[PDB]
Design a protein around this motif. Sequence first.
Motif, PDB file in Angstrom:
ATOM      1  N   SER A 140       0.770  -1.243   0.000  1.00 54.82           N
ATOM      2  CA  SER A 140       0.000   0.000   0.000  1.00 54.82           C
ATOM      3  C   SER A 140       0.803   1.296   0.000  1.00 54.82           C
ATOM      4  CB  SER A 140      -0.989   0.020   1.174  1.00 54.82           C
ATOM      5  OG  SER A 140      -0.333   0.168   2.419  1.00 54.82           O
ATOM      6  N   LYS A 154       3.256   7.310   3.330  1.00 54.60           N
ATOM      7  CA  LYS A 154       2.984   8.712   3.575  1.00 54.60           C
ATOM      8  C   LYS A 154       4.287   9.453   3.831  1.00 54.60           C
ATOM      9  CE  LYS A 154      -1.519   7.239   5.491  1.00 54.60           C
ATOM     10  NZ  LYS A 154      -1.261   6.106   6.456  1.00 54.60           N
ATOM     11  N   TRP A 185      -3.170   7.157  11.938  1.00 58.38           N
ATOM     12  CA  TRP A 185      -2.205   6.048  11.727  1.00 58.38           C
ATOM     13  C   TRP A 185      -0.829   6.387  11.296  1.00 58.38           C
ATOM     14  CZ3 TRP A 185      -4.784   2.572  14.135  1.00 58.38           C
ATOM     15  CH2 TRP A 185      -6.115   2.245  13.813  1.00 58.38           C
ATOM     16  N   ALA A 205      -5.508  -1.230  11.738  1.00 58.26           N
ATOM     17  CA  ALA A 205      -4.982  -0.813  10.452  1.00 58.26           C
ATOM     18  C   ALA A 205      -3.866  -1.765  10.049  1.00 58.26           C
ATOM     19  CB  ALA A 205      -4.434   0.612  10.501  1.00 58.26           C
ATOM     20  N   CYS A 212      -3.533   1.658   6.727  1.00 59.49           N
ATOM     21  CA  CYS A 212      -4.860   1.833   6.157  1.00 59.49           C
ATOM     22  C   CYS A 212      -5.850   1.082   7.026  1.00 59.49           C
ATOM     23  CB  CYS A 212      -4.910   1.264   4.726  1.00 59.49           C
ATOM     24  SG  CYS A 212      -3.730   2.026   3.615  1.00 59.49           S
ATOM     25  N   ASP A 213      -7.045   1.641   7.198  1.00 61.74           N
ATOM     26  CA  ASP A 213      -8.070   0.981   7.994  1.00 61.74           C
ATOM     27  C   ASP A 213      -8.261  -0.486   7.579  1.00 61.74           C
ATOM     28  OD1 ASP A 213      -8.580   3.308   9.437  1.00 61.74           O
ATOM     29  OD2 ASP A 213     -10.254   3.916   8.167  1.00 61.74           O
ATOM     30  N   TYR A 214      -8.420  -1.349   8.570  1.00 59.97           N
ATOM     31  CA  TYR A 214      -8.609  -2.757   8.322  1.00 59.97           C
ATOM     32  C   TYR A 214      -9.999  -3.148   8.827  1.00 59.97           C
ATOM     33  CZ  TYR A 214      -7.759  -7.820   8.385  1.00 59.97           C
ATOM     34  OH  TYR A 214      -7.885  -9.177   8.179  1.00 59.97           O
TER      35      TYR A 214
END
Length: 398
Positions: free
Chosen positions: A23, A26, A83, A239, A243-245
């Motif tokens: 993924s 950032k 996050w 996450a 990323c949100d899980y």
Amino acid sequence: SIINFEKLGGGASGGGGSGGGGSIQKTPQIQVYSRHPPENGKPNILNCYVTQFHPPHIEIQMLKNGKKIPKVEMSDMSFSKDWSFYILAHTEFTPTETDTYACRVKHASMAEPKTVYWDRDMGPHSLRYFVTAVSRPGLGEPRYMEVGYVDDTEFVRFDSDAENPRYEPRARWMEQEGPEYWERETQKAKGNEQSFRVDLRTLLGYYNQSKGGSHTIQVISGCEVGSDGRLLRGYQQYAYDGCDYIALNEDLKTWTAADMAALITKHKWEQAGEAERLRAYLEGTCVEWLRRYLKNGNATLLRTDSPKAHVTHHSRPEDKVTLRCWALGFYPADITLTWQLNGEELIQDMELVETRPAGDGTFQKWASVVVPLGKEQYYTCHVYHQGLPEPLTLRWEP
């Protein structure tokens, strides 16, 4: 006291697939600034605050005239609600008129290292646990951490990378808790550590990812309680790679899965009644512990330090000038800074920096606006802090 976690995966891995996934990362945001007002010849502390990055692996160097400063200290790393990770690097220094300082950051999100130069011109409560598990192929066992917060104040920490991992008090008022508390928390953490170690391996399969990549699982678990002692909100959010899980919904009964990998965990948890287990922990155990920590941390926790503010004046190209409103040494971090022209707020043209730590427990922030030369007295700065009896009003003084 953090909950004992239930594994996200079914256990068995595989999922015939490799090199099929990964993924977005950032990019770190960077701020370089001194703890105290810079006075040439006076020892001070220079900070390099790095935020908003993901993955957590990062390299930070502080430079003096282009040369690496050997003695640079690094705060422990934390991560926020979105996050992304943040950390504060700092070194002692005595600024001079001509010495340039900079902070260089190397992170996977960027092609080359980023160098940022120091520009020295002029009533509820919550108990939340922030959990991080980072795999690191080749470099050893995954790093596992549990960080506890009472109203955004870190009060306990367990880090597997310590020589013999153990829960540690992070506020003096937690020193009251006896050996049995620390022992039980330490053992629960090590049990949780194993759970995340297995989940790291399993999700690696659910996402058909390569066996040599580093991945992260993060959790925010806890309770927010109103002044009446009633649960306002329960949190159980996960996450994967930032990323949100999956997350427990406000009803404390159903789950929101962010992708198909998470649907496997969702189905698994619905069958085992995990939502009910968490509801019980969130409404009972979590609230009880929060009350106990608030009791012990009473005299320390509620406290506030109002901002000491002032305005600085800086030249701009030709007939314009910059007025910078500074708010220093305040606590907590929440604050609002605004510039007004004729009693009207000028939000849509102010420049501001994210609130940042001075490193001594207090915070700093500034907001600026560009005005016509000679019109400085038509503007006022307003500082709204929860520690202020009344919002502050300041003007540039020559």
